Amino acid sequence: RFDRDRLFSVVSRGVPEELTGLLEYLRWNSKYLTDSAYTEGSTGKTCLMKAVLNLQDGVNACIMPLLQIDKDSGNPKLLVNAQCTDEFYQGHSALHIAIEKRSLQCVKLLVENGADVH
Numbered sequence: 001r002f003d004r005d006r007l008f009s010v011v012s013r014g015v016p017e018e019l020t021g022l023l024e025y026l027r028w029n030s031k032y033l034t035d036s037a038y039t040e041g042s043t044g045k046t047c048l049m050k051a052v053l054n055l056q057d058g059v060n061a062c063i064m065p066l067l068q069i070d071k072d073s074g075n076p077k078l079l080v081n082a083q084c085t086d087e088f089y090q091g092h093s094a095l096h097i098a099i100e101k102r103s104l105q106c107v108k109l110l111v112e113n114g115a116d117v118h
Helices: 004-010 022-028 047-052 063-072 094-100 104-112
Strands: none
Touching: 004 047, 022 063, 047 063, 047 094, 063 104, 094 104
């Protein structure tokens, strides 16, 4: 299987290969990275937001693999446009984090993959 506390540890590392098995577990159990089980729970914050936090030299090699696994899972509510849900951080998104972290490389990467700019 493949689970949140493993995944959130992988998205902070410089090697994405530890994601192997995630697409198989998601697509065999009919689940997606936008589902509540794969979020920080207090805010509805996702693995992609946790990947856009802590960028090494302005980039993170795990972001494209996460977006590939999400597209390969067939998720209707695409991970790139997932937002926080609590009263304080409602509507916060990975694109807002990429902009505040000052990574034009990450903003380009998110917008190329269908990040809603509105």
